Design a binder for this molecule. Structure first.
Ligand SMILES: C[n+]1cn([C@@H]2O[C@H](COP(=O)(O)OP(=O)(O)OP(=O)(O)OC[C@H]3O[C@@H](n4cnc5c(N)ncnc54)[C@H](O)[C@@H]3O)[C@@H](O)[C@H]2O)c2nc(N)[nH]c(=O)c21
Ligand SMILES: C[S@@+](CC[C@H](N)C(=O)[O-])C[C@H]1O[C@@H](n2cnc3c(N)ncnc32)[C@H](O)[C@@H]1O
Ligand SMILES: Nc1ncnc2c1ncn2[C@@H]1O[C@H](CO)[C@@H](O)[C@H]1O
Ligand SMILES: [Zn+2]
Ligand SMILES: [Zn+2]
Lengths: 298, 114
């Protein structure tokens, strides 16, 4: 009802609990476009609504927060979503972005190359991915779980996301991965979030809120993607730009969340409860050092 | 002594009726900000638009060296406020205009020290 005044719509809990078979996604409003404010790019609007929704969750926000953003380049050669993330995040937050193709960015550091080439010494408090393979468009066969950059993202989260950290990873009807839904069960909570400005697309951000580093819930990713599509198929979302007009409470709250080093041995129920509530980040607090592997040939 | 002069070439291109650089990244904001020129977060007032700084920098956009002993960029990682009446060409506005060293407003579009 009041849905059109929200930044978007999160998949309701009851849909996550279903056991649906995967069907073709057929949206009532497919192809329709929101009316954006004058001179605002779709990707600025979309990232603004994602950050507006992330403001409602218990994200951990330490001093010297570290955020990495994959799929940050555009066909325009600039990085609108990075500009939004930099606007939203506390001043001084270290933001690294990356894409296959060259682009100009406001991030503190940018790596150009296939995501599989990206390595980082440090862990991260927030991972955002907008990666999407143009070839996903060439649908021949049945819609099966995809590998490619999703394989990398799953490994990257498990190896490099701090406990208590969060993720938002873009999926669509055909661009999705079963193991990534499975990994949503390793967070204190998760959802699939659809921006109101892009409500006519099967796009969603799969959001994992406060990473626990082990399964809290066993999720079957084939079934969960089917549940997501069933929700989309049966719940038309009205395109809306409304939330773009009120930016007065936009910046992420500076919570100053504690960061601690803890070994495998010391993560008990007490610690898991703090991680779960967005009150703790566990990782080293050394320098941030990243690199991209370069294949040399002739 | 040879050096590409991107700044002049762009001024020359504009003067002969060329279309300004597009795809400067305009931010959503309150438009109730300080109105200063180059800031850590969008600060547009009612008379301005805020843009992602890298996207409004000629040197960043043309993939060329920034013109100064160490290749430092004034705009990248920051937000630039552009008067609405000039927001059709943010790159040209930043090229042609100067920031007041004292109050941080644009000379001629906000700075009132003189
Ligand atoms: C959801 N859906 C999918 N299809 C069909 O299935 C194909 C693959 O479906 P998809 O997984 O790509 O999802 P969808 O079409 O909803 O994605 P969309 O184009 O809205 O793209 C979502 C986001 O992905 C990114 N993206 C899309 N194309 C590109 C690209 N070429 N390059 C980079 N990013 C891209 C952008 O971020 C974009 O906003 C579609 O191209 C279409 O033939 C549909 N057909 C009907 N008739 N009705 C539907 O509801 C429907
Ligand atoms: C929808 S576009 C990103 C738009 C961008 N987030 C913005 O803010 O406008 C998807 C991006 O994912 C990138 N991408 C796709 N597969 C990738 C991969 N394997 N490695 C790195 N980037 C990849 C593309 O090059 C492309 O620029
Ligand atoms: N991590 C979270 N941060 C904030 N609100 C949450 C979170 N998890 C769940 N919610 C709320 O509880 C519901 C799922 O429990 C959501 O639909 C919302 O009402
Ligand atoms: Zn520059
Ligand atoms: Zn002045």
């Amino acid at each position: 009802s009041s849905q059109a005044w929200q930044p978007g719509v999160a998949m309701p809990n009851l849909y996550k609990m279903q056991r649906m078979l995967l069907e073709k996604c057929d949206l009532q409003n497919y192809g329709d476009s929101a009316t954006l404010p004058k001179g605002i790019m779709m990707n600025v609007a979309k990232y603004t609504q994602l950050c507006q929704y992330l403001n409602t969750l218990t994200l951990a926000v330490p001093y010297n927060m570290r955020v990495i953003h994959f799929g940050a380049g555009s066909d325009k050669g600039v990085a609108p979503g990075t500009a939004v993330l930099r606007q939203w995040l506390p001043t001084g937050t270290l933001l690294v972005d990356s894409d296959l193709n060259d682009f100009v960015s406001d991030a503190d550091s940018t790596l150009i190359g296939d995501c599989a080439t990206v390595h980082t010494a440090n862990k991260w408090d927030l991972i955002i991915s907008d990666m999407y393979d143009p070839k996903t468009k060439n649908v021949t066969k049945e819609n099966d779980s995809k590998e490619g950059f999703f394989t990398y993202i799953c490994g990257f989260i498990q190896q490099k996301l701090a406990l208590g950290g969060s993720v938002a990873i873009k999926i669509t009807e055909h661009s999705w991965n079963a193991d990534l839904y499975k990994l949503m069960g390793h967070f204190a909570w998760w959802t699939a979030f659809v921006t109101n400005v892009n409500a006519s697309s099967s796009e969603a951000f799969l959001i994992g809120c406060n990473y626990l580093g082990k399964p809290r819930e066993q999720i079957d990713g084939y079934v969960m993607h089917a549940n997501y599509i069933f929700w989309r198929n049966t719940n038309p979302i009205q395109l809306s730009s409304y939330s773009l007009f009120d930016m007065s409470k936009f910046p992420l709250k500076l919570r100053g969340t504690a960061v601690m080093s803890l070994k495998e041995g010391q993560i008990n129920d007490m610690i898991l409860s703090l991680l779960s509530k967005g009150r703790l980040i566990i990782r080293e607090n050394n320098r941030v050092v990243i690199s991209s592997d370069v294949l040399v040939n002739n | 002594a040879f050096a590409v002069d991107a700044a002049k070439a762009y001024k020359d291109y504009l003067a002969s009726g060329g279309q300004p650089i597009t795809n400067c990244v305009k931010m959503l904001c309150t438009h109730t900000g300080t109105g200063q020129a180059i800031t850590v977060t969008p600060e547009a007032n009612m008379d301005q638009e805020s843009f992602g700084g890298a996207s409004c920098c000629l040197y960043c956009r043309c993939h060329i060296d920034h013109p100064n002993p160490k290749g430092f960029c004034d705009l990248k990682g920051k937000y630039v406020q552009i008067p609405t009446t000039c927001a059709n060409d943010p790159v040209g506005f930043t090229l042609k205009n100067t920031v007041c060293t004292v109050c941080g407003m644009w000379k001629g579009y906000g700075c009132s020290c003189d």
